[PDB]
Amino acid sequence: TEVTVLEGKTMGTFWRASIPGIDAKRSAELKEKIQTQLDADDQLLSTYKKDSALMRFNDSQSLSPWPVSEAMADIVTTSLRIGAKTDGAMDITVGPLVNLWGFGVQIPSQEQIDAMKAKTGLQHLTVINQSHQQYLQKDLPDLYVDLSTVGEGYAADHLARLMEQEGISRYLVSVGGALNSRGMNGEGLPWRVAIQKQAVVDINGHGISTSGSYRNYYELDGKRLSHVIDPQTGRPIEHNLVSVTVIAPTALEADAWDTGLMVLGPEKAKEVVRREGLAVYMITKEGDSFKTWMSPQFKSFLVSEK
Amino acid sequence: TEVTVLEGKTMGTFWRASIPGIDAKRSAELKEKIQTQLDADDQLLSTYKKDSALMRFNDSQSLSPWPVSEAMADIVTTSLRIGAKTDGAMDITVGPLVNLWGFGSQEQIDAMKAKTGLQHLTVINQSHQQYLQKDLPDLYVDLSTVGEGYAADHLARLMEQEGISRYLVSVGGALNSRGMNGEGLPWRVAIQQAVVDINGHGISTSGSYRNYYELDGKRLSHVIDPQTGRPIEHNLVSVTVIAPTALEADAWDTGLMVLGPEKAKEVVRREGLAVYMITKEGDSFKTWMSPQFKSFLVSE
Amino acid sequence: TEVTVLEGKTMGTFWRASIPGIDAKRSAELKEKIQTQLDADDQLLSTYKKDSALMRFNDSQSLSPWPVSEAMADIVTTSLRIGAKTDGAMDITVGPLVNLWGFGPEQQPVQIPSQEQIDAMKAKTGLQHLTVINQSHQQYLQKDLPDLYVDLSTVGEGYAADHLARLMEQEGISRYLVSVGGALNSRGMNGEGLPWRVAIQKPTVQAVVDINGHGISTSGSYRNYYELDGKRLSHVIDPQTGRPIEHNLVSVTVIAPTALEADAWDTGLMVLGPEKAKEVVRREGLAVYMITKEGDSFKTWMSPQFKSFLVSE
Amino acid sequence: TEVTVLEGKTMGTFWRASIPGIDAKRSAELKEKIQTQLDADDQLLSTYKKDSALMRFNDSQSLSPWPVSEAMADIVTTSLRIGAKTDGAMDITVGPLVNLWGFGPEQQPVQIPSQEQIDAMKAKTGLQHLTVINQSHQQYLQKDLPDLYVDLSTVGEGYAADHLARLMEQEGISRYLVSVGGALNSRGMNGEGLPWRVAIQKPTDKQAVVDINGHGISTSGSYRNRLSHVIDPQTGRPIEHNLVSVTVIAPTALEADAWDTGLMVLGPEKAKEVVRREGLAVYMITKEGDSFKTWMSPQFKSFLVSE
Numbered sequence A: 001t002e003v004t005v006l007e008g009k010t011m012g013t014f015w016r017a018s019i020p021g022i023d024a025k026r027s028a029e030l031k032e033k034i035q036t037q038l039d040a041d042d043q044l045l046s047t048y049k050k051d052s053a054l055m056r057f058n059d060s061q062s063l064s065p066w067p068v069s070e071a072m073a074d075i076v077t078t079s080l081r082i083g084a085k086t087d088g089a090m091d092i093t094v095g096p097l098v099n100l101w102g103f104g105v106q107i108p109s110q111e112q113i114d115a116m117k118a119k120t121g122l123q124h125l126t127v128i129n130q131s132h133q134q135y136l137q138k139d140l141p142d143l144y145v146d147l148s149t150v151g152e153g154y155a156a157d158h159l160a161r162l163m164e165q166e167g168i169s170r171y172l173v174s175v176g177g178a179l180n181s182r183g184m185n186g187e188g189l190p191w192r193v194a195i196q197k198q199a200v201v202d203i204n205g206h207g208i209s210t211s212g213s214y215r216n217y218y219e220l221d222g223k224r225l226s227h228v229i230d231p232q233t234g235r236p237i238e239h240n241l242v243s244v245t246v247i248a249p250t251a252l253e254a255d256a257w258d259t260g261l262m263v264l265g266p267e268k269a270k271e272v273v274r275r276e277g278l279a280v281y282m283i284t285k286e287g288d289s290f291k292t293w294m295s296p297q298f299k300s301f302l303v304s305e306k
Numbered sequence B: 001t002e003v004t005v006l007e008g009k010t011m012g013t014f015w016r017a018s019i020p021g022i023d024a025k026r027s028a029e030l031k032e033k034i035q036t037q038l039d040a041d042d043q044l045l046s047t048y049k050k051d052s053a054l055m056r057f058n059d060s061q062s063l064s065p066w067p068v069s070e071a072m073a074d075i076v077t078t079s080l081r082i083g084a085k086t087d088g089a090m091d092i093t094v095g096p097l098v099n100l101w102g103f104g105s106q107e108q109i110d111a112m113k114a115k116t117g118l119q120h121l122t123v124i125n126q127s128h129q130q131y132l133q134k135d136l137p138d139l140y141v142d143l144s145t146v147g148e149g150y151a152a153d154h155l156a157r158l159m160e161q162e163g164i165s166r167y168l169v170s171v172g173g174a175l176n177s178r179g180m181n182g183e184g185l186p187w188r189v190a191i192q193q194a195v196v197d198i199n200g201h202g203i204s205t206s207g208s209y210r211n212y213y214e215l216d217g218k219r220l221s222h223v224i225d226p227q228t229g230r231p232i233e234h235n236l237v238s239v240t241v242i243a244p245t246a247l248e249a250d251a252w253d254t255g256l257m258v259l260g261p262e263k264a265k266e267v268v269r270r271e272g273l274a275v276y277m278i279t280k281e282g283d284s285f286k287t288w289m290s291p292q293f294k295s296f297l298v299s300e
Numbered sequence C: 001t002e003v004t005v006l007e008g009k010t011m012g013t014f015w016r017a018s019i020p021g022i023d024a025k026r027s028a029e030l031k032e033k034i035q036t037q038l039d040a041d042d043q044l045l046s047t048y049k050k051d052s053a054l055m056r057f058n059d060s061q062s063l064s065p066w067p068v069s070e071a072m073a074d075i076v077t078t079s080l081r082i083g084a085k086t087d088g089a090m091d092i093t094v095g096p097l098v099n100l101w102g103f104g105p106e107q108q109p110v111q112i113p114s115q116e117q118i119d120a121m122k123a124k125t126g127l128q129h130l131t132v133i134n135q136s137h138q139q140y141l142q143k144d145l146p147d148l149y150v151d152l153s154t155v156g157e158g159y160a161a162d163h164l165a166r167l168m169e170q171e172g173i174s175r176y177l178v179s180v181g182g183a184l185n186s187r188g189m190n191g192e193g194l195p196w197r198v199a200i201q202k203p204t205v206q207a208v209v210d211i212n213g214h215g216i217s218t219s220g221s222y223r224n225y226y227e228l229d230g231k232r233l234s235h236v237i238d239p240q241t242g243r244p245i246e247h248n249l250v251s252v253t254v255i256a257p258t259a260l261e262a263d264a265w266d267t268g269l270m271v272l273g274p275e276k277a278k279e280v281v282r283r284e285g286l287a288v289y290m291i292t293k294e295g296d297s298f299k300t301w302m303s304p305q306f307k308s309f310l311v312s313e
Numbered sequence D: 001t002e003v004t005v006l007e008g009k010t011m012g013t014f015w016r017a018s019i020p021g022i023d024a025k026r027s028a029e030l031k032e033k034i035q036t037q038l039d040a041d042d043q044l045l046s047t048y049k050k051d052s053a054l055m056r057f058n059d060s061q062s063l064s065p066w067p068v069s070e071a072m073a074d075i076v077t078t079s080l081r082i083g084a085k086t087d088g089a090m091d092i093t094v095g096p097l098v099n100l101w102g103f104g105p106e107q108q109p110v111q112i113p114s115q116e117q118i119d120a121m122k123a124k125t126g127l128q129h130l131t132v133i134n135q136s137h138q139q140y141l142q143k144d145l146p147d148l149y150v151d152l153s154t155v156g157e158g159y160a161a162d163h164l165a166r167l168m169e170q171e172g173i174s175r176y177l178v179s180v181g182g183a184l185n186s187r188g189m190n191g192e193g194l195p196w197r198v199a200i201q202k203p204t205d206k207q208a209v210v211d212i213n214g215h216g217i218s219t220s221g222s223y224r225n226r227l228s229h230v231i232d233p234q235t236g237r238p239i240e241h242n243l244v245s246v247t248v249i250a251p252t253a254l255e256a257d258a259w260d261t262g263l264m265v266l267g268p269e270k271a272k273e274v275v276r277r278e279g280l281a282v283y284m285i286t287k288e289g290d291s292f293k294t295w296m297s298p299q300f301k302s303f304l305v306s307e
């Protein structure tokens, strides 16, 4: 009935873990184990750690097979495909363009943007899988891969795997915006998952991840300048889709989809969500108010009651 | 709330789907969509169809990248990875060795073994396409030991695309489930009288008490060890695996069955797998559960 | 156990379908199906859209057979019959007359009372001017007066509700309570084996009726709107008198084999008035409930056939 | 609680009315009213009575509109439409082809198998020859062929059952199970507050329950397994498929009785195409060799009893 909560820092954000029925000691051990695992995940994906596995790939100039871990190969493989399923809205090679703008301290880019698009593109990345090893291969020397739009999802899922190892079957795990829910909370009820305005959903056995455009676009005046850049135009998105929440089997998928959908905007997002049978929640600032939209698949998660 | 159940046949076996109460009309639609997908999956990897994706590849003598669906690449990728973590016990290239046994041979079987080997396959994943690639023309891939596992995971995702997030789906010896029952209770999945809650996971089982045999210490088995070309001979009667996906469960499943009690337990501990085994000692059987597996057990 | 209620707007009014518990996706697919069908009926009948099948016929001047759909033929067919059974009270061709008082919907209340040009207008009116022709693969409407104007607004809600129900059946749902405007249709029991709730206007325990296998429709409300000049002033116009009804009838509810029929009967019964209405009710042995305002009080009245539909639970 | 059961003869078959809480006096009066009404319907549609309304029309040679009742109008209209929707399988003008074989129940036949002369006979049949005209106080039937012969027996039973339903309403009776031949309409609860029991018998050679509260049902078959006496109005000869029984549930007994005969004629495959498209609730029984196989549509399933 008692719910122990563990929290800490990771990947420039925060992680949480709610585990029912744990003693002070095992709680201690688990925090140690959790922090250590996320630390290693940070060391894997972090773009700020010039020494991370990812940055080491980014720094190299090789065009031949580059050994990486199974996780890394899986993270990239799913990132590429969902990138392709979002007409390219979800691009893990868009870093150069985001840097040109100085988003996520600048001078609007003249026409360096066109020339910068040439050093971006999903089709430049390849994942090779073999029995005893996996590899990332780029056909562009200065291709730059950033995975901060999916790292939180991956971390949340990996965190689920840690619970299994530690023989824990009931838990509320989250890293930043991504969460995985399983089992009943303190009381014999599903963990409460509040989506942004606090409508609640029950994702027991599923994962969730939110994503949006907040740059003075979320309840603000002086309406101007979006920091989400469409990897197709090389420029700021213009539509009014401010928030996208996705529920899926894994938090990694949830995390890959929401970014891409966010980028595409309302119209296109809906076309993709319908075609893929995804459970999505959308907030758009049309009038001075915020209107919502929920695909059918997303409603079945709503907590019908109180 | 009610509880609807849909079933049929596919891949030379049976498929089932348990969904919270639904109406007859929607049942017929979901049933048709399910059967069509499973049919699609079978047309993809069945070795009995001369025109399945897998067979066209098997028939190709090309050593250059052969394009395949995302599913194909993913099934292969897991097979090769779990194939290594099990000392090659779980081999998807063993086909030419199993064939020369008529089960499911002179020491000349080393000939078929030559055209065998997990290191002969590579999977290439790109944004808009995937490819399989073999460095041996003769290489022959077979995914029967893993098909049900995938099919089951794929069915659960179809249910997901259909707005059904609460379910218990199964294909052959594999099951997949996420969500509670009509009541906020776990879908009852009984082990070979213990039950487990596999919410968010998959589960596969190999062999049964009705698939173990007599005549001396000789354990009669159809299961052929890839690193031998000959039938296994240990005392592992059955093995059940709970994993993140039924596809992985199905993979570890046959891998562990090939290895046997002792060797398998080694992997189970190393890989931290959720496993349940039954072995034959005297005239009785013993049960062994990894700690990880014990955590999924559900009483009341 | 639990009921799924879908809702929307159509024909300038509200529609509602109370169905037994359904998923989310399935529920979205249904509403989708329903709205489409309802939009299609609106485009079929609406006198408000100049592109509708009805308005096109009205705009035509030919006297030969004009091809229409099964629904059109059927709707006109039972409006002519119920029309004659009410002695012209239910007249789908009374349009030219109404347009003379600037009454009805919202013809911008500025049309003073007419003179006796209503006389020269009723000559553009007449149930005898319409014929319906049914064949195996096609149907037709036929008028013998070029300027005949057919208005199906008093019977449209009833047809929509019945068509909505036949759509529920096509979708495998045989238990439901469906409504469009003031017309309701139902058949099959609740999730609890009980009758779907259908309340009746309580002038001052409210009456409840089980309309299983039938359709129902009401005209008016005890929330009247007449008192100033001449006891009762209405916007409804007697098709045979060319003038606004002046009687005591506050509202009439009719239960019939279909919402369509029920919608035709109550309009015509509302026009006729209390006594004339009762004669036709007795003669056709209809299931009717009436509310009349006597003197600072409302009185209720039920035909024997109507009492038979009452649920005494 | 006590259910009174009334029965009698009509249209060469039998009708039954099960009604709860009714007393001796009322039942006696109802039995009179029912039989009186049925008689009139029989007098309206029978082709076995040379005096009936339908026969007067059949015997005439008129090409101009022929005045009939609303019921006659609606019956024909519904039959003509469902006739078209079943690809002419349900044909109310096929009577002369049937007689050619002498497969009319009241026919020997011991005739002589007709030769392809059946073609010169189909020419005297067809749903496109009939027209229904409705007006304020009148309705007409019009045929563009003298010798056209209309027969409404494959559908008169559904109309009688639905007509019986209206009768029940007139008398203030809300709970009943009323039937005429193989067509029934169910409404309300039985002796115990339970849905009237309606079963679908198996054998159709030579048993499930459904709750059709607020709906109607009719069954059609080809009882008598090798040579069928069901004539395909489009070929002029006996059907060849193995469908032997079709049960249809619909909002009205007329519709149900109209469809089941059409589907029966079409066969399993073509019938299922129709069931699917029209979203009909149907149950079919096919006999391969000596093995009976069944098939229900989704809409039918929802009427299956579950508890």
Ligand SMILES: [Ca+2]
Pocket: A148, A149, A150, A209, A210, A211, A255, A256, A258, A259
């Ligand atoms: Ca993201």
Ligand SMILES: [Ca+2]
Pocket: B145, B146, B204, B249, B250, B251, B253, B254
């Ligand atoms: Ca397996």
Ligand SMILES: [Ca+2]
Pocket: C154, C155, C217, C219, C263, C264, C266, C267
């Ligand atoms: Ca009306």
Ligand SMILES: [Ca+2]
Pocket: D154, D155, D218, D220, D257, D258, D260, D261
């Ligand atoms: Ca029939």
